[model samples]
Target: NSVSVDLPGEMKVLVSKEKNKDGKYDLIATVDKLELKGTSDKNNGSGVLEGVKADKSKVKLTISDDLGQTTLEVFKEDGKTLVSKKVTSKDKSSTEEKFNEKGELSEKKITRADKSSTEEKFNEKGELSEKKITRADKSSTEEKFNEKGEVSEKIITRADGTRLEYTGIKSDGSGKAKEVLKGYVLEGTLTAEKTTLVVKEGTVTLSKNISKSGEVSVELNDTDSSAATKKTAAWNSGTSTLTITVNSKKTKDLVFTKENTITVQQYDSNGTKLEGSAVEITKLDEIKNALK
Candidate 1:
């Protein structure tokens, strides 16, 4: 005869009277509080588990800490050996899985430590137009959306890092930011989706965008976090329009989409003919890729 154990907090313990040929759990342990720390190169931590036994319908559990302490809370129920409840604590946060009425695992929520308030605005087509992030008087990040609601400009007023602004260039053909805004070196490419940003000869950073699951996610060095910065230039704090100031003396008139056919020649510092050295030839492509 087999018995099933159902406890609170999404913990379902199944114990077979015959513990398999080798006397082990034939099925995997469905305990929520018991989780492996990591697969490899992980810091091995300790935790506790509390549950009722299925075989004898008794209370039994094991807890690990500085000293592994296992306990079995026993109580008399109809004369047969019965278990009640057990308690254990450790220097780690134990997991608890909750279930909904449909017998499915409910989702978990996250708590953030540092918070930066920001706002985002989207057009009727769900195209993002503006974003703003602010924490203090001098700390803010803002972006303005093109007609397609793609971020055409970005400004970051960092408190810990140098303040910088980035503006999207309308093509006149040279890939190097011509008619560029006053900012740092062209660190990386800013795609229309505004998801990934790669610095020139530097790091390829992943963007925090809404996932297919409709949850906003962020990743730093590939480890995903369930947080995303507001995407509008004027989130909750200020205006949505991003201002630009040109820095390059060689940069001629800033180009826009209206005059989409202008052609400009490009040359290296020593006048070398770089492959694809023509100016803004891809303006049409840039506008096309601009996300809606």
Candidate 2:
């Protein structure tokens, strides 16, 4: 025998006859634009026990509930492919990515179940066209890019709320001209294997020397200064400190603390901040051989 129940809305649920000899029945529930199915005991007791529900406005199907630690949501539009793919989690330190459709990934943000520190937008080609980042210090930076995915400009808002814009640099570190670095200031904490760099001033041929004690020394040609200078940076991996010198005259220390990652904030000859204004502390290599 089968039983049927009518809901408040245009809804109905049916506990149909068992299709097998195992004493299990099929429960089919339909409520305005939604059809959900589940297995039920011959007494129709397993439907609610399985955590099955339907929301009208936004049809939601909770696939599984594990003491609420993890949840799976199935979403759909009127007749479109899928929505709610941008689902939310509880503990929530996950990165949220939204699909802009035509089935391409459009925007991505570092979501801590709530606020985000970084967001990147993609061009039609799925190229990372623009991005915004908030430094750990609460300082924020917004960067804009072209369809070519080149940095046309960027702005920095310090924690103090002061704003500085980095724009109007013609030749960039696209590695197109390989112009050579005017000089640079490397930032961040490091002790990882392999380091890489790239500046719009063009290409700066880099050579690294790992000392006996594992200190890292990188020598490069600095042609951006009014003087064609020779620059060297000694990075002590043990202490995670770096001391860079311009032609044996100047030195500045950049210490890599546990919280700090590699920050390659480079500058140009005019004492103006140039390309590479937007830096990430990936602790890994990108621009793979941009400086190698």
Candidate 3:
């Protein structure tokens, strides 16, 4: 049964189960009060109530059933502008829409039963341009979509003062390396087949089989510095040594212990290279044995 109400207005309302002859219900409230009443009554709703201002300029109508309730109001004086619409479920979750004076949908908001909600803005063609999700903790995520409706950017903000943004989701890359190399000074990242050793030395990046499923090769990259300083480091399982080719055509073997008392390098404060000092470079085995 649609709601029944008393108020001053020329507006009318009614509802039915069958949707205005279209399975999708496109005819309800197409333009005027007569439409609001006639279409709804013959469309869908068990309860209906309508109210109008004393001057009959603004009218409000509510239709409900055991499942949910819908409130659609209009500024009747302005070409019967359907300015606001809200549909609330029995559990109190709701979806609301706002329209501009020109009848364009300016915004749409959906609140879930958890009190979390998504506020969306629409493009001219009705595709969403952005959506702001507000979580129960008041944290939020802002997502902007491209013309194709694909997310182009997203920034997440948390009450804990954390704000992180990502251009897109990454499939694989550097991963938690400190966990395995806590004994060393290196950091780590990975892919499905490879893991990279980020040597803070600002020199070579070691790519190894972090997946540990395939080859036991450790590769080096000069991606951080000189381009001509091409490099490579491959771990030979049979020899238990890492063959390194750095800059020169010759190769050197880095016997994995890992190490102890690393030889440090430095240029002259005056730009001269003296015999470098030393620090403990242990735990090479951390990443070595980590692969195999």
Cα lDDT tens digits, model 1, 123-168, are 4455556667667344676778788555567666545444344565
Tens-place lDDT per residue, model 3, 1-292, is 3443222122233334345455423222322433343333323333444445545656555555432555656565653777777776656678888887678898999998787999999877778888999998877988888766776666666655344444543435323432232254444544445544454234555554334352344555555444345555556767445555544432344443232122223234332333344233357653343222
Candidate 1 structure lDDT: 0.33
TM-scores of the models, in the order given: 0.20, 0.35, 0.37
Candidate 2: regions farther than 4 A off? 1-64, 67-76, 87-89, 112-116, 172-292
lDDT for model 3, please: 0.52
Backbone N/Cα/C clashes per model: 22, 8, 20
lDDT at 197, model 2? 35
Which candidate leads the pack in lDDT?
3
Q: Order the candidates by TM-score, highest first — what do you get? A: 3, 2, 1
Off by over 4 Å in 1: 1-113, 122-127, 134-140, 160-162, 170-292
Q: Regarding TM-score, does 1 or 2 come out ahead? A: 2
